[PDB]
Write an enzyme that holds these catalytic residues in place. Structure first.
Site, PDB file in Angstrom:
ATOM      1  CB  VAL A  36      43.284  43.972  41.236  1.00  0.00           C
ATOM      2  CG1 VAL A  36      41.774  43.962  41.327  1.00  0.00           C
ATOM      3  CG2 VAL A  36      43.727  43.600  39.812  1.00  0.00           C
ATOM      4  CE  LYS A  80      44.354  44.799  34.372  1.00  0.00           C
ATOM      5  NZ  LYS A  80      44.964  43.580  33.755  1.00  0.00           N
ATOM      6  CG  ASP A 132      44.996  38.165  33.569  1.00  0.00           C
ATOM      7  OD1 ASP A 132      45.657  37.975  34.613  1.00  0.00           O
ATOM      8  OD2 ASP A 132      44.408  39.242  33.323  1.00  0.00           O
TER       9      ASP A 132
HETATM   10  N1  LIG Z   1      39.335  40.275  43.005  1.00  0.00           N
HETATM   11  C1  LIG Z   1      39.173  40.395  41.688  1.00  0.00           C
HETATM   12  N2  LIG Z   1      37.913  40.375  41.194  1.00  0.00           N
HETATM   13  C2  LIG Z   1      37.780  40.495  39.873  1.00  0.00           C
HETATM   14  C3  LIG Z   1      38.865  40.636  39.029  1.00  0.00           C
HETATM   15  C4  LIG Z   1      40.136  40.630  39.604  1.00  0.00           C
HETATM   16  C5  LIG Z   1      41.359  40.727  38.800  1.00  0.00           C
HETATM   17  C6  LIG Z   1      41.616  41.490  37.679  1.00  0.00           C
HETATM   18  C7  LIG Z   1      40.794  42.493  36.975  1.00  0.00           C
HETATM   19  C8  LIG Z   1      40.694  42.514  35.579  1.00  0.00           C
HETATM   20  C9  LIG Z   1      39.916  43.465  34.936  1.00  0.00           C
HETATM   21  C10 LIG Z   1      39.259  44.396  35.697  1.00  0.00           C
HETATM   22  F1  LIG Z   1      38.473  45.324  35.079  1.00  0.00           F
HETATM   23  C11 LIG Z   1      39.327  44.415  37.063  1.00  0.00           C
HETATM   24  C12 LIG Z   1      40.098  43.461  37.701  1.00  0.00           C
HETATM   25  N3  LIG Z   1      42.893  41.198  37.221  1.00  0.00           N
HETATM   26  C13 LIG Z   1      43.392  40.301  38.038  1.00  0.00           C
HETATM   27  N4  LIG Z   1      42.514  39.967  39.014  1.00  0.00           N
HETATM   28  C14 LIG Z   1      42.951  38.942  39.979  1.00  0.00           C
HETATM   29  C15 LIG Z   1      43.642  39.497  41.209  1.00  0.00           C
HETATM   30  C16 LIG Z   1      44.017  38.358  42.134  1.00  0.00           C
HETATM   31  N5  LIG Z   1      44.014  37.079  41.414  1.00  0.00           N
HETATM   32  C17 LIG Z   1      42.658  36.706  40.982  1.00  0.00           C
HETATM   33  C18 LIG Z   1      41.941  37.863  40.306  1.00  0.00           C
HETATM   34  N6  LIG Z   1      40.288  40.515  40.930  1.00  0.00           N
END
Ligand SMILES: Nc1nccc(-c2c(-c3ccc(F)cc3)ncn2C2CCNCC2)n1
Ligand SMILES: N[C@@]12C[C@H]3C[C@@H](C1)C[C@](O)(C3)C2
Ligand SMILES: N[C@@]12C[C@H]3C[C@@H](C1)C[C@](O)(C3)C2
Ligand SMILES: N[C@@]12C[C@H]3C[C@@H](C1)C[C@](O)(C3)C2
Ligand SMILES: [Ca+2]
Ligand SMILES: [Ca+2]
Ligand SMILES: [Ca+2]
Ligand SMILES: [Cl-]
Ligand SMILES: [Cl-]
Length: 345
Positions: free
Chosen positions: A33, A48, A163
């Protein structure tokens, strides 16, 4: 749209010019991400990039599963989709999938680690988890591995579950006993056990069940909740496991008021309703939202359920190119939500 390339986390990302200033913010499920600035709206987003989304039928179906789930989720306490993109110009070129959501800078471990939380703040954090769970559970979606690192939190303590619903050594300290020990039946209230473990730790600053292995963790659990009845053995397939549990010296259930000394008695009462071994007797998310512990936050008009979610695909074995084509269809058909989807009550 024009795409550009940037090496992030030792691999090339290819993203529309719309998303600028990408910076890595950690791994996610089956991907990594980056935070980014959305130049179209001025909003901060998280992007992501899925890792090897079509390497095998396992990867390809999990890619489809994740995109289908995230396209369905429309709730303020659940990760949903602002955008989904691929640099591919056709199905024949399609091998990379990027998912976009609102940026959430922290996880729940960042909230409690260096801050003695107030009870009012703990109420708000747990309330939000339960509201998100009511929504996903209403669509017959279960998290199954809910834990602080799967709760994304922004700068104002607004929280989203991520998740969930997704057939490296993870912590097991928040897992429901029926999941950790592979018991024969379980329901949506697996996630409520995890909420209890999370809430206990927010209140005390200490892990509730920090077991070194599955047996040590079970012993810590039984010391709190007491030795189970014979009825609970019905759920355990392994004779060696049942024999071991039955062999343990009997322990009484502890009075949670003596465990969570100084806590709001309403918090203690809610914990007693969540941390029960019998998943059929555990409080549900919707019931927990009505508990007096959340009285200052509860709002029945703002605790919605989900639209029906068709998971018939889960029972199907398709070829890799079929999952890929279905995934491509879902990318192409995605309709971004309006920027403002809420109105004053
Ligand atoms: N910083 C942040 N903000 C929002 C989500 C995430 C995210 C996503 C994710 C899922 C779907 C998507 F479309 C985009 C991102 N998957 C894991 N993380 C994690 C990355 C670090 N741990 C906490 C969040 N991270
Ligand atoms: N690299 C950044 C760091 C912060 C989040 C996101 C990504 C937007 C930004 O403007 C602030 C740049
Ligand atoms: N209340 C918020 C929390 C985060 C920073 C700022 C203020 C913008 C926002 O979209 C994300 C809402
Ligand atoms: N975290 C613990 C694990 C065991 C059950 C309960 C919760 C009381 C305790 O003293 C023993 C601490
Ligand atoms: Ca309200
Ligand atoms: Ca109202
Ligand atoms: Ca509005
Ligand atoms: Cl559906
Ligand atoms: Cl389906």
């Amino acid at each position: 749209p024009t795409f550009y390339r940037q090496e992030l986390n030792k691999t090339i990302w290819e993203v529309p010019e719309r998303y600028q200033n990408l910076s890595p913010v950690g791994s996610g499920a089956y991907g990594s991400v980056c935070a980014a600035f959305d130049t179209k709206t001025g909003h901060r987003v998280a992007v992501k990039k899925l890792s090897r989304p079509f390497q095998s039928i396992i990867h390809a179906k999990r890619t489809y599963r994740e995109l289908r789930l995230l396209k369905h989720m429309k709730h303020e306490n659940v990760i949903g989709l602002l955008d989904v993109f691929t640099p591919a110009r056709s199905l024949e070129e399609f091998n990379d999938v990027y998912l976009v959501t609102h940026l959430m800078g922290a996880d729940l471990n960042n909230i409690v680690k260096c801050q003695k939380l107030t009870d009012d703040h703990v109420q708000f954090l747990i309330y939000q988890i339960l509201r998100g769970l009511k929504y996903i559970h209403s669509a017959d979606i279960i998290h199954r591995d809910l834990k602080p690192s799967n709760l994304a939190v922004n700068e104002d303590s607004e929280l989203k579950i991520l998740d969930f619903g997704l057939r490296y050594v993870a912590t097991r300290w928040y897992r429901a006993p029926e999941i950790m020990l592979n018991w024969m039946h379980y329901n949506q209230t697996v996630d409520i056990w995890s909420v209890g473990c999370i809430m206990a730790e927010l209140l005390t600053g200490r892990t509730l069940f920090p077991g070194t292995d599955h047996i040590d963790q079970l012993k810590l659990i039984l010391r709190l909740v007491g030795t189970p009845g014979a009825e609970l053995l019905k759920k355990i397939s392994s004779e060696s496991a049942r024999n071991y549990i039955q062999s343990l010296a009997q322990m009484p259930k502890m009075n949670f008021a003596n465990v969570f000394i100084g806590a709001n008695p309403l918090a203690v009462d809610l914990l007693e309703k969540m941390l029960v071994l019998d998943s059929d007797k555990r409080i549900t998310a919707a019931q927990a939202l009505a508990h007096a512990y959340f009285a200052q936050y509860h709002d029945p008009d703002d605790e919605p359920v989900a639209d029906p979610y068709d998971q018939s695909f889960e029972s199907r074995d398709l070829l890799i190119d079929e999952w890929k084509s279905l995934t491509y269809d879902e990318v192409i058909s995605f309709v971004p939500p309006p920027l403002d989807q809420e109105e004053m009550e």
